[PDB]
Write a protein that binds this ligand. Structure first.
Ligand code: CLA
Ligand code: CLA
Ligand code: CLA
Ligand code: CLA
Ligand code: CLA
Ligand code: CLA
Ligand code: CLA
Ligand code: A86
Ligand code: A86
Ligand code: LMU
Ligand code: LMU
Lengths: 163, 160
């Protein structure tokens, strides 16, 4: 009803009443899911732009398949073999399930008000990144399906100084 | 530490001294891992053998590729002429969702790490005295023989 993540641009934004009564556990699970989807969206937005200008020269499949040649965007999933996707998914699962490659020194020792404001800002930035990723995916798919549709050319219609 | 798992001829078979220090949680997690590895090994046995036989489900997997058109063995997943990566990724995601939303303990059956009753069972209430121990030994031995055979099959099809 009233917790972190309520800021004045609007105020509550629950039109369809997806929560209504629920419970503390269900609300906490929903908050965790929102934070996870938000962090994933922010990482996706950051990673959708970097390869346009920089490229690591590693040979996914030694001998050939060298990053320097695979397409960027939604066309990489077809080029990358299934083995690499499985390996990286298993790796991130090892990171998530266990404490491996994770350090509790990032929790920090911030005071209460600072922590609350920082959490609200984190949620806001992530909520923006979600729709950012949605728009990126829709533009990429529409352009790839039919070249010339949505005449704005190049990936990343903004930031035209890259090209 | 003498429980289900040293049945048949030899007894405590720990040539490397794995359980030199030992603990209960390590014991339980190792038994659970062995059981899961064996179960997946025998299910993969069923799948691999029934595919090598020649049987195939009807229909198509991709846009115009039947279930019987894909190669048999390692080439199905990796290498030229393989299943489209989108379909394989979708199947992997579905399997992950099923694993994370089906085989968890949501009631409290507990007992052995690997029991997922959640109220549903056929006859695991009337039998009690000793069928549990030898049944668990049977499943463990089948899993171990499975894992050995499936590693052999994979290496044979790789070197073949
Ligand atoms: C979206 C798909 C998905 C998801 C989310 C999960 C999620 C999970 N799986 Mg899982 N699994 C899946 C698909 C999935 N699975 C599929 C398709 C299979 C094959 C049928 C398995 C087989 C499997 C097994 C056998 C086990 C899990 C386990 C687990 C849990 C912990 C995993 C972990 O710690 O990271 C992974 C962490 C690792 C350290 C990875 C270990 C990799 C080993 C050491 C190497 C294997 C050799 C390699 C594959 C081939 C080598 C090639 C050679 C040239 C060197 C977690 C709930 C474990 C579990 O239940 O824990 C109690 C467990 O024992 N899974
Ligand atoms: C082996 C890999 C692995 C494993 C075991 C898990 C395990 C989990 N993930 Mg997860 N995840 C993974 C990879 C993995 N993730 C990857 C690669 C991504 C993409 C970034 C995500 C994105 C993701 C989101 C967005 C959410 C989860 C959630 C969850 C949890 C519940 C899943 C559920 O309800 O059913 C499925 C569980 C702890 C959910 C969660 O914890 O919130 C309830 C959730 O909302 N995951
Ligand atoms: C949704 C996230 C996501 C996904 C799915 C991908 C997927 C992909 N990226 Mg990518 N990338 C991402 C985020 C992501 N990236 C981000 C955030 C950056 C900026 C750093 C990049 C920068 C980048 C480059 C420069 C290149 C790729 C490439 C690729 C492709 C080859 C696989 C690979 O090497 O991945 C690499 C994936 C990463 C490096 C992301 C790792 C991010 C984790 C979270 C960092 C973890 C912390 C780190 C280890 C340091 C810890 C210190 C502590 C303070 C945190 C593949 C399609 C290659 C390619 O050929 O693309 C066409 C390539 O050359 N990516
Ligand atoms: C010493 C450790 C080690 C070793 C020996 C390998 C070996 C290999 N890696 Mg690799 N990798 C490792 C660590 C390692 N990796 C780590 C730590 C990462 C970071 C996540 C990666 C990320 C990575 C990527 C992104 C890619 C590889 C690829 C490859 C293969 C090169 C091409 C090839 O032979 O195709 C032959 C390939 C096969 C015969 C298929 C192998 C299938 C794998 C082994 C199954 C993995 C299952 C998974 C671990 C657990 C189950 C799923 C999980 C959800 C439960 C080769 C088998 C490439 C590849 O697979 O291309 C095909 C590739 O694209 N690796
Ligand atoms: C796929 C690989 C991978 C992934 C997903 C993670 C994921 C994570 N690591 Mg991690 N880590 C990894 C590999 C990975 N690790 C490896 C190989 C090492 C070296 C051994 C570390 C060392 C490490 C440390 C020391 C710490 C983490 C932390 C974290 C957590 C927060 C990361 C963050 O906010 O910064 C991700 C930020 C970015 C991706 C932005 C990149 C900025 C670009 C490059 C600027 C240009 C998160 C759970 C932190 C944590 O858990 O604290 C709470 C922490 O303190 N990791
Ligand atoms: C990966 C699958 C796997 C796993 C996790 C285990 C795990 C275990 N086995 Mg086992 N076993 C397996 C496959 C496996 N087995 C197979 C395929 C066979 C048939 C050859 C056997 C035959 C066998 C016998 C005959 C006995 C065990 C025993 C044991 C337990 C104690 C030994 C130990 O710490 O092993 C840990 C194993 C590993 C860490 C795997 C090695 C990985 C390297 C690094 C590669 C332990 C729970 C003993 C037991 O339970 O006695 C009560 C025992 O007597 N096993
Ligand atoms: C490790 C377990 C495992 C894995 C990874 C697969 C994976 C696959 N099987 Mg398969 N299969 C399995 C177990 C497995 N099956 C079992 C236990 C049986 C016996 C009923 C079969 C019988 C079977 C047939 C008859 C056929 C496949 C086919 C296929 C391929 C495409 C269809 C699909 O997505 O799955 C199909 C999923 C199932 C049939 C579900 C099996 C029952 C589950 C595991 C319980 C795919 C690579 C098709 C193919 O293209 O051949 C290569 C095909 O024609 N499988
Ligand atoms: C102590 C230690 O060890 O580490 C510590 C370090 C530190 C920092 C303290 C810690 C932290 C916190 C972290 C990780 C903070 C990082 C936060 C981060 C990186 C947040 C990204 C936001 C991205 C946004 C909002 C993008 C919007 C994108 C938008 C709005 C777009 O429109 C995208 C766009 O594409 C469109 C749709 C159209 C295109 O034409 C144009 C562009 C490209 C513009 C940790 C976790 O405690 C660990
Ligand atoms: C609702 O959900 O239903 C109920 C349905 C139903 C049916 C009741 C259920 C089930 C019970 C099931 C499925 C039980 C399955 C048991 C199973 C699947 C047991 C496999 C053993 C395989 C072995 C021993 C392989 C050995 C393989 C060996 C020893 C080898 O090395 C073989 C070989 O390999 C090589 C090396 C090379 C070849 O040149 C030569 C040979 C062949 C020498 C379930 C889940 O309860 C679900
Ligand atoms: C997921 C996290 C990603 C972070 C990875 C860490 C990035 C930092 C180092 C990565 C740079 C990889 O590229 C670096 O090694 C490559 C190994 O193939 C080498 O790349 C070069 O050598 C290869 C193998 O000899 C050959 O295919 C080519 O000559 C060329 O690609 C170069 O030495 C350098 O381009
Ligand atoms: C998948 C797992 C195996 C299931 C066995 C057959 C299902 C796969 O094939 C099934 O594809 C569609 C699913 O409704 C249906 O049919 C569809 O695919 C047919 C064969 O490509 C085409 O005529 C059309 O794309 C569509 O009508 C049929 O039912 C069956 O052809």
């Amino acid at each position: 009803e009233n917790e972190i993540g309520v800021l004045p641009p609007t105020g509550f934004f629950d039109p369809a009443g997806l929560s209504d009564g629920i419970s503390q556990e269900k609300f906490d699970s929903y908050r965790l899911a929102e934070l996870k989807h938000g962090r994933a969206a922010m990482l996706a937005v950051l990673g959708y732009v970097a390869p346009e200008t920089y490229r690591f020269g590693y040979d996914l499949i030694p001998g050939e398949l060298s990053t320097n040649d695979i397409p960027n965007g939604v066309a990489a999933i077809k080029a990358i073999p299934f083995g690499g996707w499985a390996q990286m998914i298993a790796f991130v699962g090892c990171v998530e399930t266990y404490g491996w490659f994770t350090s509790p020194t990032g929790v920090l020792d911030l005071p209460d008000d600072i922590l609350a404001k920082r959490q609200t800002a984190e949620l806001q930035h992530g909520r923006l990144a979600m729709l950012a990723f949605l728009e990126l995916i829709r533009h990429d798919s529409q352009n790839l399906a039919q070249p010339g549709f949505d005449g704005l050319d190049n990936l990343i219609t903004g930031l035209p100084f890259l090209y | 530490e003498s429980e289900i798992g040293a049945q048949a001829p030899l007894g405590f078979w720990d040539p490397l001294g794995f359980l030199d220090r030992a603990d209960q949680e390590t014991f339980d997690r190792l038994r659970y891992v062995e059981l899961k590895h064996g179960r997946i090994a025998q299910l993969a046995f069923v799948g691999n053998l029934i595919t090598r036989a020649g049987y195939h489900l009807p229909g198509d997997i991709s846009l115009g590729r039947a279930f019987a058109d894909v190669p048999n063995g390692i080439a199905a997943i990796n290498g030229p002429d393989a299943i489209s990566t989108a379909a394989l990724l979708q199947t992997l995601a579905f399997i992950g969702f099923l694993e994370t939303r089906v085989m968890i303990d949501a009631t409290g059956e507990s007992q052995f790490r690997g029991d997922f009753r959640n109220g549903f069972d056929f006859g695991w209430d009337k039998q009690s005295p000793e069928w549990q121990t030898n049944k668990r030994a049977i499943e463990l031995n089948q899993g171990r023989a499975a894992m050995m055979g499936i590693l052999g099959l994979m290496m044979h099809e790789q070197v073949g």
